[PDB]
Structures are given as C-alpha cells and as structure tokens.
Automatic annotation (TrEMBL), chain A:
GO terms for biological process: chromatin organization; DNA repair. This is RuvB-like helicase. It comes from Chaetomium thermophilum (strain DSM 1495 / CBS 144.50 / IMI 039719). It is found in: Nucleus. Gene3D superfamilies: 1.10.8.60, P-loop containing nucleotide triphosphate hydrolases, RuvB-like helicase, domain II. Belongs to the RuvB family. GO terms for molecular function: ATP binding; ATP hydrolysis activity; DNA helicase activity. DNA helicase which participates in several chromatin remodeling complexes, including the SWR1 and the INO80 complexes. The SWR1 complex mediates the ATP-dependent exchange of histone H2A for the H2A variant H2A.Z leading to transcriptional regulation of selected genes by chromatin remodeling. The INO80 complex remodels chromatin by shifting nucleosomes and is involved in DNA repair. Also involved in pre-rRNA processing. GO terms for cellular component: Ino80 complex; Swr1 complex. SMART domains: AAA (SM00382). It catalyses: ATP + H2O = ADP + phosphate + H(+).
From TrEMBL, chain D:
Transmembrane segments: none annotated. Keywords: Activator, ATP-binding, Chromatin regulator, DNA damage, DNA repair, Helicase, Hydrolase, Nucleotide-binding, Nucleus, Transcription, Transcription regulation. The lineage of its organism: Eukaryota, Fungi, Dikarya, Ascomycota, Pezizomycotina. It is found in: Nucleus. ADP binds at A5, H6, H8, V28, P60, G61, T62, G63, K64, T65, A66, Y343, R381. One of its GO terms (molecular function) is DNA helicase activity. This is RuvB-like helicase. InterPro entries: AAA+_ATPase, P-loop_NTPase, RuvB-like, RuvB-like_C, RuvBL1/2_DNA/RNA_bd_dom, TIP49_P-loop. It is an enzyme of class 3 (hydrolase). It comes from the Eukaryota. Belongs to the RuvB family.
From TrEMBL, chain E:
ATP binds at A5, H6, V28, G61, T62, G63, K64, T65, A66, Y354, R366, R392. GO terms for cellular component: Ino80 complex; Swr1 complex. ADP binds at A5, H6, H8, V28, P60, G61, T62, G63, K64, T65, A66, Y354, R392. It comes from Chaetomium thermophilum (strain DSM 1495 / CBS 144.50 / IMI 039719) (Thermochaetoides thermophila). Residues 50-340 form the AAA+ ATPase domain. InterPro entries: AAA+_ATPase, P-loop_NTPase, RuvB-like, RuvB-like_C, RuvBL1/2_DNA/RNA_bd_dom, TIP49_P-loop. Coiled coil: none annotated. This is RuvB-like helicase. One of its GO terms (molecular function) is ATP binding. Belongs to the RuvB family. Signal peptide: none annotated. It comes from the Eukaryota. One of its GO terms (biological process) is DNA repair.
Length: 439, 120, 459, 438, 449
C-alpha cells in the first residue's frame, strides 16, 4: 500500500522475554545489542509503569549500531497505548517560535490525557421533513433496518433550515450537543439529479439502530489541549501549525484542571516518551532548558541518541563528550551500542532481504556479509535492493554473487568514495575554491 | 491584461474550457480527499485518531468543516452570532455542589470556563 | 457521559518530590536533616531569611544568587522556598534560555515574567439572582400611556433553584434583555443587580425530554441559593492586567473578532501602560480594596542571561513595585554571554553581582549522600538492603549524587523482575552495568574515537 | 524550440541489458555512471522502496546534472521529478526542515483518472422546479438538452449571473460552471449594451472526455492546511492575510496519508512515488542533513538523488567538521555513491559535435578541432559557449557555416575566466586610477 | 524659539558674484566650502540635473552639517530638503534599499493643481431603495439612496450609488445634517447640524453650522504639494476608494512595503501626464545623507544604480572619517569610509579646521544667539578652549556659565562663571584622564572595563 519498505520496517518490537527482560539472540527483527536491548527493556518497563517522571536516557554509539532501530523497537513494543513523540533536534530551530517553546511543545505532546465516554448519536437517511405553523414539526429517518418519526423542536427546525436538509440526505444528530451535521446524500439518490454541486458526496445508508450509545476511549496530548485553548478555534492550529509562543499562564490553568480530572477520576494521565534523535544538534541554550523541563511531574521519560565523540557543543567553542554539556550529562544515564560481529551482520542482512523479499543465494549472502564487515552495514544493506534489480535485468531467479559484484562495482562505499575524493582533489572544488577544469 | 490570462484559463483556480485542471482539483482537494469533510472526520473520531479531541472541543463536525473552509472574515462574522455561555456558567455553577459543572462536550474549553473577565 | 475511573489517586515522583520545605526551627536554625533535606544548613538558614524577607511586604526589588556547583541543591532550595511560601504567593520559575523569544524583544519577555511574579488580590461582592424561569408575567400599569394601549408597570419572574424559589419583581426594562436573549419559561438565567439585565445559561435539563429532537444541550438547575450575595477573592497578577489592557478580549467588531481568531502574538507592552497600571493599583491599595502580594521570580541557569538582560534588570529591580529575584548559577569564572571580552564570577557582570545577596551551596560529605539515598529510595518506593544502600552511596562519592539516585528505579525493576520485593547488591551491580555514567562512557569515546574509522565515533 | 544546456540529453542510452552504449541518447562516456543511474531508474519504477539516497560525486562539468535530467526523462512525465538546489531551502517563511518536508511530498504523486461530462450550450430554459431544484435547458447548433440541477449546482449557476440566452459551460460531476458569454442571437437586443456576445456552440451540447489527473501529497497538504483560492478572498488584503507557508504538523500529514490510502483502497487513486533531486547538496547545512537522516526513514519518502562537486570541504554550519563532498560522514553512509569522471579529448570532440547540431550550428572539421582544443585546454563549458557567438559572426559574414575565422574571432570577443584572471593580475597590480578594485 | 546647535546659521552668506563674505549669515570662514556649497545650490535650483553626488569631507566639528542646513535655507521652503543619517537606513520592516528609494522619491517634489468636484447642502430627505437578491445568503441589499441637499441657492436631489451610501452611512449622516460629498473619492463628511432647529438642549454636543452659501454643486480648485513618495504610498496602500479593499485597508495596521520598481515607473507615467496637462510643476530637491560612513557596501552599490536613474535628487553626503574600513566589507579600507567605486562619482568639498580667531568669532556669534551677554575677557577665556579643547566644548559651556552668573546675581558672565563651568562640566579628555588614573587598578571603586 502507501507504506513502502523502509530502513526500520523489519523492526517489529524490542525482542525480549517479557518475564525476565532477558533479550534473545534474535527476535522481532533485532539481532545482538543484547545489553542495549535489555537496558531499553528496563527503560520500557518504567515507561509502562509510568510513575518515574523525567528520566533521561542517552543511546550512544558509532554509526549503524542500532540506536535508531532500538528506539523504533521500543516504540513498537510500547504499542499505541502510550504517546511516543519522535523529534529530530533540527525540528526545534523553528522560525515561528523560540527553541524553548518548541521543546515545551514536544514535552507536552508526550503526556496523554485518557477519557472514556458514552454518547447518543442519531444517524440515518432523512425520509421526510414535515412542518406546522399556527412552531413544530416531525422528522422521518430510516436506516436499512429501521424507520421512525421524531418530533422536532423549534430550534431543531431552524437548524434543519440552516443546514438545508433535504430528503435523501444522511444526517447525524449528536443528542448531547443537539447540533446537526450533514454527512452527505444516500447513494440511492445518485439518479436524482443530472448535475451535482462540488460539495456533494454520496454515502451508504446508515445501518442498525437509529440512535446508538457507543462507548469510546479518547487519549489527547497535553499539547492538544494547549493549542485548543490557544485561541477561539485553536484546534485548526493542530494541523497548520500556525501557533504562537503560547502563554505560560494558559498551560498553568490546563495543568491545574488536568489534575482535577485525575482527582475526580474523569481522566487517566498516560505519561509517554519523547525520543530526541541526534540530540547533539541541540545547543547550550536548549540543554540548559531541558534540565528544568525534566523537573516537572508532567515530564515524560526522554530518550535520546548521539554518535558524537568528544566534539564541540553547539552555541559554544569548548568540546565535550557526545557533544553534550557535562552539566546535562550529569542528569543522564547512557546506553552504549557496539559494532556488530560478522554473524550478527549475516543475520541482519538476511532479515533485510526477507523484508525486501529478495532471495539471496547463500554465496551472495556470504559475500554481502564480507562487504558489511569491510564497508559497513548500511552499504551492504543498500546492495540488496541493487542486486535484486540487476538480477531482474538479467531475468535471474535468485541474486547471485555476480549481481552483488556488479552492484559493488557500480556503487561506491563511503571509504572508496573518500579515496576517490582524495585521488581527484584538483578536479574537485577545494575548501578554498580552487579547481582546474582542464584536462 | 489579455483575457487569455485574466479570463480564459491563465488563472489556475478558475475552471472552464482550457483550464480543465481547476474543476477536478477543486472537488478532490477541497472535498473528496479533504480531511475536514464530515465523512473523513467521522472515520477518525476515536482512540488515538487525529480527531479524537473533537468530542470535547465544542464544535460539531459541521462547524469544524465550515471553520476549515471559510476564511477568517467569514468565520469572524459567524462568531458575531454566538453566545459566550461558558462565561455565564462561571457565574452560576460556582459552588461545591455545582462541582464547577461544564458540559462534557466543552470539557477542553478550560480557559473559557475559568476566566476572571466574566466575574469582574 | 464520561465513564469515571475508580482507581487510586497516586502521584508521579520527580527529582524533587522528596523536598517538602526548608526544615527550620522556629528559631530559624536548620535541622540537620528535615523536610527532605540533608545538610546545607547554612544555605537553608539563609533561604529561611529570604522566605521571611518575601513574607514581609517591605521588600522590593532585592536580588538573591544561589551560587554553587552542579548537583549542590540550588534548585531544591528554590523549590523549598516556593513550598514555604505556598500557593497564595506567586512563584514564577524560568530559565535564562526562555528569555530568547522570537516574538518580542527579550527585555519584554523578562518584564512579563517579572510582572507575573507580582500578584494582586482583589475582593469584591458578587450579587445575583439565579434559577430556572418558573414564570414570566407582566403587571399592567395603573396609568397607561396614551396611544400605546399596552403599558406594563412591572414584569414578574419566578426563579427556582435546587434550594428554593422566589417571586421576583423586576423593572420592565428587562423586556429588552429577555427579548434579545430569548429567555423562556424553563430556561436557566441569572439577573445581575449592577445592571438589571439578564443572561441565559441554557434550558433546564428538567425539559430534556420535551422533544425527541431539540437543537440545544440542557443545563442543570442552579444548585445554590436563588439569590447569591458573596464576597469573591480574585487571584490576579499584574501581567494579567498588562495583557487585559493591551489586548481587550470581548470586542464585538470585525477586527476584534478576526483578531481573536488569529494567534495572540505577544507585544512590547509600553512602560506608559505599565506605569499607569501601577498608579491605579496603588490607588486601590490605598483604598484597601486590594492587597499587593509580591512573589518570587526565580531564574535558573541565570548564566544563560546576557549582559543586555542584566542591564535591563538594573532598571527593573529599581521599580517601586517588583518581586524578589532569585538567581541560580554554576558558572565558575566564565565569559558573559553578550560581552565576549568580559569574564566574571558566576557569569554575572560585576556591576550586577554587587546588587545580589549571594548564598553559597557546598558539596556533600559521604554520609550526607548516604542519607539522601535513604530519603530518595523511600520516596520512589524502592526499598534497599543496607549493602545496596552502601553500594549506591559509594557511587555517589566516586561519581555523582544524581547518577546514584537514577540507579534506584532500574534496580527496582530488575529486583521485581527477579522476583525480589527489595533491591540487593546483585541488582545494583547490574543497574550500574546497563546504565553507565558520563565518565565511563567518555572513556569508551576516548578509546574508540582516537581516529576516524569505519566503527569510529564522529569528532 | 529553444536550446538550453541539456536539451541534447534524451535519456541514459542504455542497452536492453542495461549496459550503456558508449554514445547514445546524446551522452558520450560516463558509461559506468549511466549504468548506475539505470539501476536507480529501475529502483524508482519498481516503487517498492522508500527513502533510498543516491549521491552523484565528481568534478564540475563532469555531467552530474545531465545524468539527473536523463533519469527525469527515463522516468517520463508520469513519475514526479522535483528538482531543487540545496540553497533553495533557506526560506524566510518557515524553518528549512519544513521546506525539506514540502519537497519530499512534491516528489510523491497521486494519479486520478477522471471522467469529465461537459455540457456547453446556450441557456434555452431555466425553470426552478421547487420552492430548490432547477431544470435548465441548454442548446447547441446540433440539438438541445435538459438537465436536473441540484440546489448546490443551481446556486453556482445562480452565483454566476446566468440568464436565458447566455452561453455557459458546465462540468457535470465536478460542479464547475462558467458563463462563456451572451449568445449573439441576442446581439441586437439593444444597439449598445455593456455585454460580450459569442456565437452559439457548434459541436455537441454534451461531451465526455477522460482526463488522467495528477496531484501530489504536498498539494493535499496545502489544500487541507488552509482555505485556498476563492475560499479566502480576504487574502486580497495582504500582510497578515496573505497565504504564508506554515510549519505543517505531522498530525496533518499523517491524517492526509490515511485519507489518501482510503482512496487507493477504493481504487480511485494510484500512488506514484518519485524523485527529489537536490543539486549543490554541499549548500545544505549540518541541520538539514540531520533532518534528512530522519526523514529518509519515513515509509513514504521518495528516492533522493544528491549531487556534489566539493572535495574535502567544511560542512556548512559546522566549520569544525571537514568531510568529503561536504557531506557529513554520518549521512554519507546512507547514500549509494556514483562517481563521475573527466572527459577524454576525443569525448570532448563528440560532445561538441552533438551539441553543435542541437543548436543548429554547423562546423568545418577544423572548426570542430579548434573548439575541441579549447574544451581540453580550458573547459568543456567554455568551448560549447563558443558555438553560438561563432554562428552569429559567420552569419554576418554571410557564411552558411562556422569556420576557424569565426571561432578565432569568438574566442577573442569572449574570454574565459582564466585569461580574464590574467588581465586582473596584470592590471589590478595596484590601486591606481585605472586599476581593478581589490 | 528654542536655541539649538545651528540656530545662528541663516544661509551661506555669499555675494551675488558667488564669493563668500568672510563672516556672514552666521558663518565664520569655510569660505571655499561655502562657495562650493553655493554652486551646489545653483545646481539644485537649475532643475536640469539628476543624481549628482556631493561629499562634505572633513573632521568632526568642522561645520559640515551647518553647511548642509545652510543649503536647506538658501533653497527655501519650496524645494524638498530631505535629511537622513546613514543609521536610519536599517529598517526592520523592509530592506534597506527600499528606505533609500523612499528617501530618493521623498526628495523629489510635485506642485499640482487639483479640481475638487463636490456637493454641499443640508440633507433634507434621505430615502433608501433596495432589492431582494437571489439567495446569496446575505439577504437584501440597498440598491440606491435618494438624498435631498439644500443650499442657499436652492436644492438638488441625488440618487446615490450604494457605494456612496456606505460613505454616508459610515459618516452617520442624518436628515437635517449639513454634509460635504466629494465626487472625486465618493467620500463623505458630516459638517454639522443645520443652524436651523439649533436648540441648546442636546446632550450630543452638536456643532450647528450655517447652510452652505452658494450653489449646491461646486467645483473648487486648489493647489497641492506632494512628493513622488506620497504617490507611491497612496497607490501601494490604497485608502481613497469606497471599495472593500480601501475600507479594510483603513482598519488594518499600517506597515511599510517594498514598493516595486513597476509601481514607481508607472507613477512616473502618471506624473508626466500631469506635467503635459499643465497641472503640475516638477520640483526636484536634495537628499542629505549625514553620517554616510554608516552606510554599507550594499547601500553604496545600490546608490550607483539609484543615481543613474533618469530622475533622481541631488545627494549630499557627509563623512568625518579618514582611511577606514567599509562597513559590511571588512576586507576593504578606503578614505572617507566610502568605497573607491562610489567616491569617483562625487564632487568632494573638503572642510577645514578653524583658526583661533575664528573660534573667538564663533563664540561671540553663538553667545549673542543664545542671548548670553558675555564680557571680552570671558570671550577670550572660552576661546582658549576650542584651541586646547574641541570647539563644541566652548559652545556648550555658554549655557552653564549663564546659569552660574545669574545665580551669582550677575547680569553678565564673567571669567569666574566660566571657570566654575569648566570645573562642574568636564571635557572628554579630562574625564578620560580620570578613568585612566582611577581605573589604574581594579577593585571595589574601579571603573568597569
Ligand atoms: N540489531 C539490529 N537488528 C536489526 N537491524 C538493525 C540492527 N541494528 C541496525 N539495524 C538496521 O541497520 C540500519 C542502520 O541502523 P540504525 O540504528 O538505523 O543506525 P544508527 O545506529 O546510526 O541509528 C537500519 O536499517 C537498521 O534498521
Ligand atoms: N540537601 C539536599 N537534600 C536532599 N536532596 C538534595 C539536596 N541537594 C540536592 N538534592 C537532590 O539531588 C539532586 C541535585 O540537586 P539539584 O538542586 O538538582 O542540583 P543543582 O542545584 O546543581 O541543579 C536533586 O534531585 C535534588 O533534589
Ligand atoms: N556525458 C555527457 N555527454 C554529453 N554532454 C555532456 C555530458 N556531460 C555533460 N555534458 C554537457 O556539458 C554540460 C556540463 O555538464 P553538467 O552536468 O552541467 O556538469 P556538472 O553538473 O557536473 O557541473 C552540460 O550542460 C551538457 O550540455
Ligand atoms: N563656520 C562656522 N560658523 C559658525 N558656526 C559654525 C561654523 N562651523 C561650525 N559651526 C557650529 O559649530 C558646531 C559644530 O559644527 P557641526 O556642523 O556639528 O560640525 P560637524 O557636523 O562636522 O561635526 C555647530 O553648532 C555649528 O553650527
């Protein structure tokens, strides 16, 4: 369908024994990284238990060591039941709001408010409207399965007039609010006219009982309640963005009321996760805010990933490990992801080939594993798709070594590319702009 | 300006002969494949779905749809008709017995239900 | 409608949940451990005088600096000050990072928070009649006006509450409100005596069954008295008065209503407005109808402020109406954010530092760290063997207080996962191995990122 | 038609087997790089894979943009190809990571096969049927027709000032309608009126035609983010009211993906993921590559092709880090890298001959020789730029073809940057009255 | 009335032959520069030239700005004199080259004859007439208004376009009001009530005004002074119509906009029609860019093109700086802080330091300008400064010394009152010594570096 195959599509969960939290050598698509998966599972336990507010966990390791994959597996294993805000650090450098507001919003996104509600909605096809004046009227509605006549009040006849409700229309009436909505017209009326207006759409007739009392569970972010209270129709800003640096006194009211809802049992607070990928792209002004942001009772658990060594923090000229302030790193616990052995590469490349529905020969998978050792996991992974397509060009049944060899011949790995850049430095634009275009 | 530009389809949004795109594109982008149409909203109204909150914002699917298609002037004219009934509730449903009552379909209008402006 | 949940009202635990106050005698002397604190007896006693400074309404525009290394409890002390003041006094915490708005100049953002930290308490009487309309009935006048044929001298309205009903005789001019508001028998309304007008809340839910369909929601009968006369106490900040004057909310024209449909962008509130607000406030204070209640603006990581923020604070603190400012800083001797040629202690300009009462916060002894581990464990609900306590406290000496407190929850998970209702050394020895500190990780970096390489860290 | 820089590039020139022909489709050489681009074409047309990155790497003038426009023509017009430069994303409206998102979604197409029922005729009758429904009579030279109109399309017909005797255009199912004019059968209803009189339509009053409509996922974003076109008239005020870009939420784009998949399941729409091509990728900064790194992991993302001509160079926004291609090594691991190489003298000769006949220039053999000599010793781009001036000079000498005389004149009227730098070095030796400004 | 730095300057003080009188019109000396500024005044008054550049070059306090303000007085009130500093160019609303163009067109004036075609009368009838529209949803609309206007010379009945009735309605006109209607704009003004029925007992605080004398329809003509920039701003932010865009454009916040070359070019066509119609005189003026060293290399590179425009004012720059770094171009140093490209375009009027007897003369001119009656020994004292200290420090002492003398009960300033003024009010150099001596080491009482 519309979901194509991606880099983390094979990641289906965190792959641990739910009893002992012991990882197993592969499951749910993950391979190796056992201590990191066990640590991630220990974090996932305290996410799900939810009482521990505002912990910060850093996933640290070289490129292509499963830091993002583990973050995906944790989100899959956490399920839909808990908020999982996924934020690239680049997203915080907004032009429409300050970086602290952009962090505040991402924090607010990660706490759910859960409400369960029952409401009466009457839905059906209009059969007739009848009106008397001397105000009163009668409404006939059908489903496929019922027809009934309802007395309409004066305000209800006005609403019918304002909405231009005809026979053959499908209407819904929320009895709790009283407001009519028109869903469309019944497809039976497809022959009622020769030409139809732009805003007209056909529907199947509603089915079953006319008025239903479904029980529904609602979970909304604290960020959604903020944006809804930002302005008179702030809910539209949930989609266009188009929102200010929201006033702190609005959030102050909202937090106080959400506590009342939890005291009264109207709602359950569902604290979730914020995952900040490439957190080293934040700056000293972000990090010093995040220190205070983690102080709140309504702070999520924050996961973050970095591949930086000892490297300069942004917004300053001194270096530090991970590119992060030591004042910040003091508040963090760190999970380290290691390189992969050839046997763990051989497994991951098989999992990718299955997800990509590529039938590697055993020799191709062996050669592809050597490339993964010699040229990196992502490059050997990217040769799978390339060798499949090249095999298809020769109508081959399976990807042979010759299809991987040609894939390796056509597309350079990073190291072979850097070698090419060094070998042709005068033909390439240098860091001082010099180049020679001649032969 | 020549009528070829100003009338006969050099305006991309104006449907007619020549401008064969505008008539299709208006229907599909504003109605069929438009998330704010009530049939699309109604499919997204529960659980973790993107309109879950619309039960507790005081708008109906019809008002949400209107507010997403009419411009800021037209929406402001519609505001002129409305009554600030949540501000009156702040005067009446005061007491512990009233539990600061609010209609549950307006639950998320916290700052309208609690605002000194009404009391002052 | 909503399906209420019967489950227990527990609470989440954060890094400061154990702190409950400053823990002082009535003589103001710090108790060696109390209210969640261990040690810092000097800094707690100093904060106790600051607490009494704030509760005495002589203070204006004083400054405090909490000075000390990271992990030394400066934010804990600020929160404890806030808890000692309680909810009736504003405490407005921000970081210096929050001042770099995109939407107004940062001196406006700071002056907003400066005025947020100043409260006003206004007492007024609410005086209304309220109920479901039991009746409306004209009284025909004794002396009708010629040519009209109808002349009403009184309109009578019955209002019922849950607690009774009253026959209410009203000046006939209320016809204007009723006819505009479309009040009917069975609607819930109130009458306010400062206008004699009426407003409609909705139809009484006693009539929710009048029709199979009607297009309004019903509202409950007012559960109070039919007549309310109450004093009402309003929590107001002076920043609320700024915004309420600088962007009026209720305007019924198209530009107002278009304005309220678009994002409420901050604006650079004039000093002329703020200075007139102050004058009218001081008038009502002198009338005794309002209390000023100045509170605390707390700025954490105040070394993130720049020299433009600090030079404005000079003027701001000199205002005759101003909160106390409490700063916290950990920046040694460091370059001023906006004056790269200038280094100073705490990262605070020497010009401004001379204004502040500095409070130093010192490190913790090995036995204080151990007592903090005990306090933290029982707050998270974790329970430890004494050998687990001593192992956690030893990491507190060798690594950091914060790291050891962050080991408690992981080890509690691993203990219960292993079937143990209390954590032991075997779990601590495992939590400390899944979850590294910054130093052990920095060693992994220092060994692995010695060069570029296929598996190297990126420097 | 006009001749731009690449109009000779017709495609990749690959064999049935996918091997490159040494001169085909207007390419010469780059065979190994054309074959690699062929596999990228197969990757795109398979539409199985999201978010694979490709990098084109090699010196300036080595054909990196010929190769990108050859792909665009192997894909044809159906598949969306969205080109940008890495400098385009520094919008002042919204954060550059929003601009990247909008460009990713322009690279994913959605195809609807739409049937248009058009009624165009003179309005012979307008009979309101209810008191809502209208019946309208329409006439062409070839007959008349009656239509039942829903009150919605009626009021559209009535919002336009249609009357009996007017000529109108109606689209039956889109609900679009236009007043074409007044029928010239009424042209003498007065001797002067402020009215436009048009002949009666002379074909069928009814036409049915099938139009394969293309939109993109970004078009759905924009339509759903804000009222568009005639929905927002107050936009005429400008300032606050104009249609500014805003930082679209992923809530919206996720909810758009839901609706779009619904219409794919109905079979109404066909999804067509395509290509986002970013030239001068070295103009992207470290924050952009940090975003691209995530965005390429979404399940929808197009194939991204990048070009760079930098050697080892500082990445923008982090001068502390120098990397090959100017691409962070973190992100470079994610890309399939295709190298491009300099051209042999004999390859330059062939490219000169190919483009000459594409500009319509014709050369003597010695004229090809002398131009090719400038290609080798100076630059391929310089020698090709000689061709048009030399043709003008030959024309005004009355000659049918460019000869050595006309190139030896062109090369002296129009210097390369190298000889121009020599002039700057000799003349800007001092800040004198006739010196160049240093 | 208030006395400021240049109140003594009245003009260039030239002879009819264009030679400078050594002391005239408030000046002392600068004669060669005053003569060069005279020839510039001739260049301006002779309309024929566009986009010539003049640079007043010379150290601070050499009267460069006095020369520019003297030019502004020799040109008189008719010619546009448009002074700006280079620091005014950095707008937050629009690019800095927009502000330059606005100032270039503000420095070109137009005097134009205008006929205002108007109706004036007491409203004696007002009767709206309306149509039931088809169902557009907004309901009925007024199709026209019939209004009766009464003047002294009888009366007329007007059937107004409803667009003009909206002007009448937003003006809150009533029957019995006196109104002015301007058929140029469709705009309306309620002048008052009639003096008929002008009874006292209105809370409304009405202005009753007499019935308009003369005919009810009038066609008065008036001469308007406008700049080209006034036309640009009028046409970029339209506000004179009764249409919805003009209406809402009065409710929106005013903001500057980057007016296009396309608009400016088409307003040249419009103004040239007024010239060919004989209703306008084009009167090009001068732009004085003070502190022109505060411009930047983008400003200066734009000025190249702006001065090449087929109409542009005369530009007078002033700069006080030696060989200095060009702002925005830290690689490039040049004299005056002006790029070597741009300096070639200008005629430089160098300006020189004053002699001690000139300082004495200026001190006496300045003293009597402020009304400071000052003894000759006191003049000599003040003129020892200006030699040993800046000239400005002399002139600034005259006011304190006057205060101190009058506080001492003196009618006139003695040497004593200056010697006290010298002590209370230091020059920069004596204060710079206090800094270096007190801040010779850090401490509690040190100056902050
Ligand atoms: N342990 C693992 N099991 C399965 N797939 C993995 C594992 N580690 C990495 N991958 C896959 O290899 C690629 C790179 O790993 P990823 O975690 O995305 O890089 P990084 O470590 O830089 O975040 C992705 O496709 C990812 O899904
Ligand atoms: N004296 C103390 N007693 C109890 N807990 C403390 C004390 N000092 C610090 N803590 C706790 O240890 C951690 C470090 O203190 P904190 O105030 O965050 O340091 P800093 O002021 O450097 O940010 C916090 O969780 C805090 O609650
Ligand atoms: N392989 C090729 N065959 C024929 N012409 C080419 C080839 N490569 C480049 N050209 C021509 O030379 C010009 C420069 O190529 P281009 O792709 O712009 O180089 P780059 O983008 O690497 O700087 C193109 O406009 C094209 O006309
Ligand atoms: N030739 C002069 N005659 C009279 N007053 C002068 C003369 N030159 C300068 N002044 C006065 O001296 C003061 C300083 O001159 P000013 O024009 O400010 O110099 P600059 O603008 O070059 O700094 C002003 O009060 C000015 O009027």
């Amino acid at each position: 369908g519309l979901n194509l195959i991606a880099a983390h599509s094979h990641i289906r969960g965190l792959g641990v024994d739910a009893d002992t939290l012991e990882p197993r050598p592969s499951s749910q698509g993950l391979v190796g990284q056992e201590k990191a998966r066990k640590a991630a599972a220990v974090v996932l336990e305290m996410i799900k238990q939810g009482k521990i507010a505002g912990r910060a966990v850093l996933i640290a390791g070289p490129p292509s060591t499963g830091k993002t994959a583990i973050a995906m597996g944790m989100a899959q294993s956490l399920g839909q039941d808990v908020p999982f805000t996924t934020l690239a650090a680049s997203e915080i450098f907004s032009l429409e709001m300050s970086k602290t507001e952009a962090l505040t919003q991402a924090f607010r996104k990660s706490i759910g408010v859960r409400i369960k509600e029952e409401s009466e909605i009457m839905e059906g096809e209009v059969v007739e409207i009848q009106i008397d004046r001397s105000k009163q009227g009668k409404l006939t509605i059908k489903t496929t399965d019922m027809e009934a006549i309802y007395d309409m009040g004066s305000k209800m006849i006005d609403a019918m007039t304002k909405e231009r409700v005809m026979a053959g229309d499908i209407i819904s009436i929320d009895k709790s609010s009283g407001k009519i909505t028109k869903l469309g017209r019944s497809y039976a009326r497809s022959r009622d006219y020769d030409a139809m207006g732009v805003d007209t759409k056909f529907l199947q007739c509603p089915e079953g009982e006319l008025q239903k009392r479904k029980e529904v569970v609602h979970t909304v972010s604290l960020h959604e309640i903020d944006v809804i209270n930002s302005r008179t129709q702030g809910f539209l800003a949930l989609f266009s963005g188009d929102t200010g640096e929201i006033r702190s006194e609005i959030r102050d009211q909202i937090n106080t009321k959400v506590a009342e809802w939890k005291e009264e049992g109207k709602a359950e607070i569902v604290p979730g996760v914020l995952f900040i990928d490439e957190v080293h792209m934040l700056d000293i002004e972000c990090f010093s805010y995040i220190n205070r942001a983690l102080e709140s009772d309504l702070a999520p658990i924050v996961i973050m990933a970095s591949n930086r060594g000892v490297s300069r923090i942004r917004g300053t000229d001194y270096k530090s490990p991970h590119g992060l302030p030591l004042d910040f790193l003091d508040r963090v616990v760190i999970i380290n992801t290691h390189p992969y052995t050839p046997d763990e590469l051989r497994q991951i490349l098989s999992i990718r080939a299955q997800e990509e529905e590529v039938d590697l020969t055993p020799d191709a998978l062996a050669l592809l594993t050597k490339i993964g050792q010699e040229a990196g996991l992502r490059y050997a992974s990217n040769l799978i798709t390339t060798s499949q397509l090249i095999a298809a060009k020769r109508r081959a049944k399976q990807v042979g070594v010759e299809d991987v060899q040609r894939s390796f011949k056509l597309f350079y790995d990073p190291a072979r590319s850097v070698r090419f850049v060094q070998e042709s430095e005068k033909r390439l634009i240098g860091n001082d702009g010099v180049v020679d275009f001649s032969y | 300006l020549p009528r070829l530009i100003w009338c006969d389809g050099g305006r991309l949004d104006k449907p007619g002969p020549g401008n064969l795109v505008a008539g299709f594109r208006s229907k599909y982008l504003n109605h069929m494949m438009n998330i704010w149409t009530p049939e699309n909203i109604r499919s997204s109204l529960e659980g973790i779905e993107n309109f879950t909150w619309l039960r507790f914002v005081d708008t109906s699917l019809q008002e949400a749809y209107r507010a997403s298609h009419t411009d800021v002037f037209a929406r402001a004219v519609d505001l002129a008709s409305k009554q600030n009934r949540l501000g009156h509730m702040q005067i009446v449903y005061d007491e512990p017995e009233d539990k600061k009552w609010t209609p549950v379909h307006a639950l998320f209008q916290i700052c309208e239900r609690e605002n000194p402006k009404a009391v002052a | 409608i909503s399906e209420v949940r019967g489950n227990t009202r527990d609470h989440r635990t954060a890094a400061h949940t154990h702190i409950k106050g400053l823990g002082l005698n009535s003589s103001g002397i710090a108790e060696k451990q109390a209210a969640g604190f261990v040690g810092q007896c000097a800094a707690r006693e100093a904060c106790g005088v600051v607490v009494d400074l704030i509760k005495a309404h002589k203070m204006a525009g004083r400054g405090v600096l909490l000075a000390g290394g990271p992990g030394t409890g400066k934010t804990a002390l600020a929160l404890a000050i806030s808890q000692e003041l309680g909810t009736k006094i504003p405490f407005c915490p921000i970081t210096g990072s929050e001042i770099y708005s995109t939407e107004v100049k940062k001196t406006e953002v700071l002056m907003e928070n400066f005025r947020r930290a100043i409260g006003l308490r206004v007492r007024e009487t609410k005086d209304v009649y309220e109920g479901e309309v039991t009746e409306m009935t004209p009284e025909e006048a004794e002396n009708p006006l010629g040519g009209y044929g109808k002349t009403i001298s009184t309109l009578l309205i019955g209002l019922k509450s849950a607690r009774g009903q009253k026959k209410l005789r009203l000046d006939p001019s209320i016809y204007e409100a009723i006819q505009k508001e479309r009040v009917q028998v069975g609607d819930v309304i109130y009458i306010e005596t400062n206008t004699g007008a009426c407003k409609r809340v909705g139809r009484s839910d006693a009539y929710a069954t009048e029709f199979d369909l009607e297009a309004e929601e019903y509202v409950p009968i007012p559960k109070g008295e039919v007549h309310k006369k109450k004093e009402i106490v309003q929590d107001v900040t002076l920043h609320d008065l700024d915004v309420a004057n600088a962007r009026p909310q209720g305007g019924q024209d198209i530009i107002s209503m278009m304005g309220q449909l678009m994002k409420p962008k901050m604006t650079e509130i004039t000093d002329k407005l703020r200075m007139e607000i102050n004058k009218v406030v001081q008038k009502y204070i002198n009338q005794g109808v309002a209390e000023l209640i100045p509170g605390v603006l707390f700025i954490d990581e105040a070394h993130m402020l720049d020299i433009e923020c600090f030079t404005y604070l000079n003027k701001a603190l000199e205002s005759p109406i101003a909160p106390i400012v409490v700063l916290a800083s950990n920046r040694g001797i460091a370059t001023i954010r906006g004056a790269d040629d200038l280094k100073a202690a705490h990262g605070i300009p020497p010009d401004f530092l001379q204004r502040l009462l500095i409070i130093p916060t010192h490190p913790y002894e090995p036995d204080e760290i151990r007592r903090i581990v005990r306090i933290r464990a029982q707050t998270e609900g974790v329970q430890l063997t004494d050998a687990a306590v001593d192992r956690v406290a030893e990491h507190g000496v060798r690594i950091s207080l914060r790291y050891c407190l962050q080991l408690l929850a992981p080890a509690s998970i691993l203990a219960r996962v292993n079937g143990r209702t209390q954590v032991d050394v075997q779990d601590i020895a495992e939590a400390e191995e899944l979850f590294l500190d910054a130093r052990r990780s920095a060693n992994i970096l220092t060994s692995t990122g010695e060069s570029g390489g296929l598996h190297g860290f990126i420097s």
